[PDB]
Structures are given as structure tokens and as C-alpha cells.
Paper text:
Members of the MenAT family of TA systems in M. tuberculosis encode a toxin with a conserved nucleotidyltransferase (NTase)-like protein domain (DUF1814) and a cognate antitoxin, which can belong to different protein families. We show that MenAT1 can function as a bona fide TA system in vivo in its native host M. tuberculosis. Furthermore, the toxin MenT1 acts as a tRNA NTase in vitro, which transfers CMPs to the 3ʹ end of tRNA acceptor stems without preference for specific tRNAs. MenT1 biochemical activity was fully inhibited by purified MenA1.
To further investigate MenT1 function, we first determined the X-ray crystallographic structure of MenT1 alone to a resolution of 1.65 Å. The MenT1 structure presents a bi-lobed globular protein, with an upper domain consisting of a seven-strand β-sheet decorated either side with two α-helices, connected by a short linker to a second domain made up of a four α-helical bundle. Surface electrostatics show stark differences on either face of the protein, with a distinct electropositive cavity on one face. Superposing MenT1 with MenT3 returned a root mean square deviation (RMSD) of 3.829 Å (849 atoms), suggesting a close but not exact alignment, which likely arises from the relatively larger size of MenT3. Nevertheless, the core fold and domain structures are similar. Importantly, when all three solved toxins are aligned, the identified catalytic regions co-localise. This allowed identification of key conserved catalytic residues for MenT1, namely T39 (S78, S67 in MenT3 and MenT4, respectively), D41 (D80, D69 in MenT3, MenT4), K137 (K189, K171 in MenT3, MenT4), and D152 (D211, D186 in MenT3, MenT4). While D41A, K137A, and D152A substitutions abolished MenT1 toxicity in both bacteria, T39A remained toxic, which is consistent with the toxicity of the corresponding S78A substitution in MenT3. Noticeably, the MenT1 crystal structure has two MenT1 protomers in the asymmetric unit. In addition, by size exclusion chromatography (SEC), purified MenT1 was monomeric in solution. This fits with what is known for MenT3 and MenT425 solution states, and confirms that MenT1 is also monomeric, with the presence of two protomers in the asymmetric unit a result of crystallographic packing.
Numbering used by the authors: 2 to 196
The structure:
Amino acid sequence: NAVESTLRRVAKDLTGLRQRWALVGGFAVSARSEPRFTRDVDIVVAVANDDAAESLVRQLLTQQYHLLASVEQDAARRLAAVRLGATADTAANVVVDLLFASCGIEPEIAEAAEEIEILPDLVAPVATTAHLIAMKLLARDDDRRPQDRSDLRALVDAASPQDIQDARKAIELITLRGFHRDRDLAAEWTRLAAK
């Protein structure tokens, strides 16, 4: 409700700014598999560099958002993501996460995303099932994020064989770019799948 209002708002704001963007997170998993409880908006935004990301964040802070946190890292792309606090709606305050260089394949995710009617009269770009599988494998944390393991099950159960292969190729690109850190994500996937 308030979450849905925030989604519509950030959707219209990013598109008006001509940003290459895609929904990830709960709305996207819900769209690709089984609707599940979602209380924030998670978006990938493909931009050229940190300077472009910061220019976009300053543009949003002139509108109905305030900055709650920045995620910075030692990589060539120092700005990984920002967390914004939305005030589109008035029942409760709602978080909006913008991901720039968090998983390392933000450009490919925005490019492969597909237009889907998420809400009545809201068509938004949604990450592919394969890209969501890759993202959830990377982000899985059972002490801090137990929804990831369940989301991953739902996504794999909803995927086609080609989706699975696309996910494995998405994992290799993440790894080629160093975003795996020290982890063999494909081997982790195999072991989770054995159950």
C-alpha cells in the first residue's frame, strides 16, 4: 500500500530521468515466482561511473527522498549502492535501495530486464529470473537474510532449463569481474540444490 505507492513514485521518477533501471528484490521475486511479503523497493540502476551515480542521487534528494545510508567499497566503482527514505506515502516511511555496483552485473540486469505490469497500471522493468537467482546466490546470508534461501527455492522452482543456464553464465560474469570475492558461487549452488 504505502510500499506500492513508493514503487509507483520511484518508477515514474527514474523513467522521467531516462535512467536504465530494473526492479530486483521482493517485487521482482514475487513477479518471477510466488508473491511474498515485500516492504521496500530494491532497484538496479546502470550508470557509467560513480560521478553519474552521485549526480543521480543529488537529483533524487531535491525530490521526495532523503539519504539514509551509502554503501562504499574499495573497487573501481566506490559507490556500490544507496539506501533512500521515501515519503511518497503517509501511512509509514518506506525504504528504497538503489544498486549501482553491488553485484557487478548491474548493466546486464538493466539491459535484460523485461516490462511487466507489476501493479494495476504500473508497467516496470523486472530483472530476469536468471539474474535474480545469481543475485540471491551472491547475497545469501542465513543469519541476516533467511528469505534469500526461500526466495532462491521459489526462483529455481519457477525457472526453465534455459533460465538455469543463463543464471550459471550470470554467475561467471559476476566472478570474472571479481564480485564473488573468494567464493565459488556455482559450487555453493550445487550444494544447496542437493538439500
